[PDB]
Amino acid sequence: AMKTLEKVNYKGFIWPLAVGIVLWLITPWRPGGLSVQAWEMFAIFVATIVGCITKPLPIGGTTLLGMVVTVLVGLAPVKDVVNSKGVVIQTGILSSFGNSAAWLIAMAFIMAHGISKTGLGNRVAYVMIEKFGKRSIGIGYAITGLELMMGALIPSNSARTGGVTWPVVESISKSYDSKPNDPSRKKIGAYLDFMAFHANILSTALFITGAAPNLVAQQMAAQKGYQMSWVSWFWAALVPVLVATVIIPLVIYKMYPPEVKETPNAKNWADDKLKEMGPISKPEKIMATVFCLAILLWVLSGFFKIPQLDSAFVAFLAVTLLLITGVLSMEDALHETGAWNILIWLSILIFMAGKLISYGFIAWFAKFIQSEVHGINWGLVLVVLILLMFYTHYFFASGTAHMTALYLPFLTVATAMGAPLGLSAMLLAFTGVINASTTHYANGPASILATTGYVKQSEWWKMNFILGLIYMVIFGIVGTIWMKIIGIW
Amino acid sequence: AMKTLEKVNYKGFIWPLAVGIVLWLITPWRPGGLSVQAWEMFAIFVATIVGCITKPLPIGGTTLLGMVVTVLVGLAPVKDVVNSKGVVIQTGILSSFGNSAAWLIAMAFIMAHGISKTGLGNRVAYVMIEKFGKRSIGIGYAITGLELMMGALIPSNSARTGGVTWPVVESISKSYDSKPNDPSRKKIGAYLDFMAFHANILSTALFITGAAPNLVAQQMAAQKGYQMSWVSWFWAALVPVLVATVIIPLVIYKMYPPEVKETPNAKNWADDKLKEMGPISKPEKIMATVFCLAILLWVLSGFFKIPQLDSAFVAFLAVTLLLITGVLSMEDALHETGAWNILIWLSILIFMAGKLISYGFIAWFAKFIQSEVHGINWGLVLVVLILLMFYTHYFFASGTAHMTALYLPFLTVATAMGAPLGLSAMLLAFTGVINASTTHYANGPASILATTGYVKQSEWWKMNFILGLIYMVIFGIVGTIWMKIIGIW
Numbered sequence: 020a021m022k023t024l025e026k027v028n029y030k031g032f033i034w035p036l037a038v039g040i041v042l043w044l045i046t047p048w049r050p051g052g053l054s055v056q057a058w059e060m061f062a063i064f065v066a067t068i069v070g071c072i073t074k075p076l077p078i079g080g081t082t083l084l085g086m087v088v089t090v091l092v093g094l095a096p097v098k099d100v101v102n103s104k105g106v107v108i109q110t111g112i113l114s115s116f117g118n119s120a121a122w123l124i125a126m127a128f129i130m131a132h133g134i135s136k137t138g139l140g141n142r143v144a145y146v147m148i149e150k151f152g153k154r155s156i157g158i159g160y161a162i163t164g165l166e167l168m169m170g171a172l173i174p175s176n177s178a179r180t181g182g183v184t185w186p187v188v189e190s191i192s193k194s195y196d197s198k199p200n201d202p203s204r205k206k207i208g209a210y211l212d213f214m215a216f217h218a219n220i221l222s223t224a225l226f227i228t229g230a231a232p233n234l235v236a237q238q239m240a241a242q243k244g245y246q247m248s249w250v251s252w253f254w255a256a257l258v259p260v261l262v263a264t265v266i267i268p269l270v271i272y273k274m275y276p277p278e279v280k281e282t283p284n285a286k287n288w289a290d291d292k293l294k295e296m297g298p299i300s301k302p303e304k305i306m307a308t309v310f311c312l313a314i315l316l317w318v319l320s321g322f323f324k325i326p327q328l329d330s331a332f333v334a335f336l337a338v339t340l341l342l343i344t345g346v347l348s349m350e351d352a353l354h355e356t357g358a359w360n361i362l363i364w365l366s367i368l369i370f371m372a373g374k375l376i377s378y379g380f381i382a383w384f385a386k387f388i389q390s391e392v393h394g395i396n397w398g399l400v401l402v403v404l405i406l407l408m409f410y411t412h413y414f415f416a417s418g419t420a421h422m423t424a425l426y427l428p429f430l431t432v433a434t435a436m437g438a439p440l441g442l443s444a445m446l447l448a449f450t451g452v453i454n455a456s457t458t459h460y461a462n463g464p465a466s467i468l469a470t471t472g473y474v475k476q477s478e479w480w481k482m483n484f485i486l487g488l489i490y491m492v493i494f495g496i497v498g499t500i501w502m503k504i505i506g507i508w
Numbered sequence: 509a510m511k512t513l514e515k516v517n518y519k520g521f522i523w524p525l526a527v528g529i530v531l532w533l534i535t536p537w538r539p540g541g542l543s544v545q546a547w548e549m550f551a552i553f554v555a556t557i558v559g560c561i562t563k564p565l566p567i568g569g570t571t572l573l574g575m576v577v578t579v580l581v582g583l584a585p586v587k588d589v590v591n592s593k594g595v596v597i598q599t600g601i602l603s604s605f606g607n608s609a610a611w612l613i614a615m616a617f618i619m620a621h622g623i624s625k626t627g628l629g630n631r632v633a634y635v636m637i638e639k640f641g642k643r644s645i646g647i648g649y650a651i652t653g654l655e656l657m658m659g660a661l662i663p664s665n666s667a668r669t670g671g672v673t674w675p676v677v678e679s680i681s682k683s684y685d686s687k688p689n690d691p692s693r694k695k696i697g698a699y700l701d702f703m704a705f706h707a708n709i710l711s712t713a714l715f716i717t718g719a720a721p722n723l724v725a726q727q728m729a730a731q732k733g734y735q736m737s738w739v740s741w742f743w744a745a746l747v748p749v750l751v752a753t754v755i756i757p758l759v760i761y762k763m764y765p766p767e768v769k770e771t772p773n774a775k776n777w778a779d780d781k782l783k784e785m786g787p788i789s790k791p792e793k794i795m796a797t798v799f800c801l802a803i804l805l806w807v808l809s810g811f812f813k814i815p816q817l818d819s820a821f822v823a824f825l826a827v828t829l830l831l832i833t834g835v836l837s838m839e840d841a842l843h844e845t846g847a848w849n850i851l852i853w854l855s856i857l858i859f860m861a862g863k864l865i866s867y868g869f870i871a872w873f874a875k876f877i878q879s880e881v882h883g884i885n886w887g888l889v890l891v892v893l894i895l896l897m898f899y900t901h902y903f904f905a906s907g908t909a910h911m912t913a914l915y916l917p918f919l920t921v922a923t924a925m926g927a928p929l930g931l932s933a934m935l936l937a938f939t940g941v942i943n944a945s946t947t948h949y950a951n952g953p954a955s956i957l958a959t960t961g962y963v964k965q966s967e968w969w970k971m972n973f974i975l976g977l978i979y980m981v982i983f984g985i986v987g988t989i990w991m992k993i994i995g996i997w
């Protein structure tokens with residue numbers, strides 16, 4: 020019954036494969052000490068990322084093409100190759116899909132559809148349109164304050180983004196007639212999408228329990244003899260985080276203003292639509308009960324490290340509660356396509372970047388940086404190390420892997436050339452937080468919010484580059500002078 | 509705006525939950541030598557399967573609830589617990605989803621949607637409705653011939669079902685107005701679904717390359733000192749397979765007839781609808797070409813063991829070709845809910861059965877049966893071993909794992925009690941083939957065809973039980989005397 024082919028953007032293929040081909044041919048001229056497979060994997064990964072920007076096919080199609088090409092040129096098995104002694108000496112593409120980040124985000128997508136089905140989403144949206152809808156930046160500051168308060172309680176940033184702030188932004192933009200993948204997207208949806216992302220960055224920076232890279236940094240710094248202690252982290256971050264809480268939202272507002280900037284009659288419009296919506300119903304009350312069990316289990320996860328409190332498992336059990344309760348048919352959860360899309364593409368990207376790690380590319384880079392800096396005072400060693408830890412996150416889809424790979428090497432560099440370990444440790448952990456202001460695979464929240472269709476990826480990458488400059492300036496300078504005002508060095 | 513709740517079948521919970529609770533509560537009197545964790549995992553598994561038949565929720569919902577319950581009672585982590593030397597000492601629930609069987613079947617589901625989207629399916633359906641179909645048992649024997657022909661070439665049984673025979677059955681039954689999850693299913697669809705399953709069983713029985721358990725059996729028999737020789741297997745199976753090729757289709761036709769048994773004008777109807785479909789189009793030409801590249805890559809799978817020829821990867825590569833050409837939009841591939849349903853539920857069931865293995869349940873069973881059979885002549889030893897090898901496949905979601913677990917133990921039993929090594933090696937390998945006539949998770953094809961909505965699972969299990977009796981009689985006795993005519997025992 021199909022007559023013509025789907026319109027495919029073939030020009031989108033010109034840039035990635037050309038880039039890949041060119042870097043393929045530069046394999047004889049690799050830096051030395053590397054590996055031919057390491058350089059080939061770098062080539063395929065960069066080609067795939069450029070494909071995620073030039074968009075031949077949606078990102079799922081581009082990452083599927085990348086994964087298929089990866090297997091085709093012999094850089095990754097399909098099944099895990101097992102040691103002899105049980106170890107997996109090289110992992111295949113099918114294990115890509117047993118990833119915690121992807122599964123947490125996908126199940127969070129399913130519960131967000133639950134929220135919007137009940138009608139709870141629009142109830143929360145109208146409550147917040149009444150209390151801050153007068154002036155859009157009021158709503159923006161509302162959700163940044165909400166994220167900042169959640170930072171100290173919900174120890175995983177992806178749970179905060181996919182469970183709370185993204186449902187809020189979606190609801191609010193639906194009540195404003197702002198739908199994704201549409202010109203309509205720019206009435207308020209895109210500004211609040213980007214603001215949610217950077218609020219998540221700020222909340223991760225404020226608390227040592229904002230994201231797992233923070234705790235990796237804490238363990239690695241403790242290995243070298245420096246104890247971060249929540250209050251230590253909090254007091255070191257308080258003033259730079261506040262300077263950022265004022266600078267970043269306003270630079271976003273000037274750079275990415277939200278079309279509709281004032282709703283002078285927001286209070287009465289919101290009250291009317293809450294009155295017509297009627298009192299809360301039993302599907303919405305059930306949904307709220309499951310939502311607060313998800314929040315409470317995520318918070319207890321912070322104190323009890325057990326499987327039953329795993330952030331992905333909390334989402335799984337929340338959705339199975341949603342199924343047994345009757346809020347959600349399983350045909351409702353099945354054709355909620357964002358979950359399976361993110362499962363495909365984010366798992367493939369995490370796998371390819373992990374291969375970048377496992378072939379010795381990041382290790383070679385750490386060794387290169389260890390050998391290249393020698394005749395310099397420790398202040399400039401610190402500036403250069405902050406810059407390198409920042410910009411190497413273009414080659415990471417995790418954050419925990421980034422810290423595991425480069426935090427202890429860079430920290431040993433800094434202390435080996437005279438810099439004080441507490442200051443350097445704090446600076447590098449902060450850079451590990453502000454790394455998120457880069458790619459769409461930087462962390463979980465970046466993967467959610469760069470893909471919802473409200474913010475194009477041109478704008479995402481460019482504005483994140485600008486904000487990364489501002490974040491580094493803020494944290495570097497303000498945090499260094501604040502951290503000796505408090506006595507850390 | 510949701511008004512009232514989705515209807516949930518709560519009575520469906522009584523039987524599984526009752527069974528689970530009682531099997532939990534009799535844990536102290538477990539058979540002895542069995543871990544409490546093995547017995548508890550057994551209880552959860554039986555509860556989940558009983559739920560898949562009593563249906564408190566769709567199969568995805570019940571297996572998800574089962575997996576959540578598994579984690580809740582401390583029988584499975586969420587992340588893999590790794591040794592401190594790379595070994596995995598306990599496997600978590602997220603690794604379940606990097607499964608080749610589930611992913612192969614899911615990508616085949618999306619490629620079948622491609623076939624039926626282009627209109628290629630209905631062209632194939634009308635060609636065979638014109639060449640067979642005036643009498644529906646003609647269609648049944650046609651698809652049985654198709655499976656029999658593919659058995660010697662395409663080494664994966666699920667690839668044969670999901671890549672070829674299921675699209676054929678769906679196409680034909682859509683052209684016969686026999687449509688799933690409704691009474692209309694009984695015009696011809698259910699008959700062709702069940703007949704496809706058993707054609708796949710027979711073709712797997714005919715050739716030593718019919719499914720992976722065959723090659724596991726041959727390697728184990730060589731470990732014990734008996735060499736199967738393709739022609740060996742073919743010659744030993746041919747006459748029993750022919751007796752089955754005559755008996756089983758007729759027993760299915762009498763037991764499960766297809767309401768529409770005669771189409772007196774089938775050839776002219778098919779010629780009419782082929783005339784009006786018009787000449788083949790470029791979308792269908794592209795789809796047919798990628799289909800036959802999939803088939804040739806699957807046949808090369810039989811001779812070259814390389815990742816680029818992996819049957820799951822071949823499915824991935826076929827779908828990415830379908831994406832590059834434009835046959836399939838990526839939103840088309842995203843809202844095909846059968847693929848994600850099969851991924852979820854089949855991955856969870858394979859995971860739970862694996863836990864059945866890894867906790868030592870099947871090992872205790874092998875040792876118990878080793879202790880139980882002692883004072884009996886070897887003919888009765890062979891009968892009871894065939895019976896046990898058949899009926900233990902209710903506690904297996906793989907088949908390869910079943911063979912790896914119990915084939916060499918049962919064979920050492922049989923040979924240790926006087927039986928001739930070639931005879932029971934062949935009898936147990938045949939039993940491993942005809943094991944499929946059991947559950948809906950028996951093998952890949954069983955999970956595909958038992959779930960399409962054409963065959964209820966009540967009738968599936970019951971009719972599979974009857975046909976399993978018939979399969980055992982045929983293969984056991986007829987194959988034993990036929991294998992005595994040849995120089996085997």
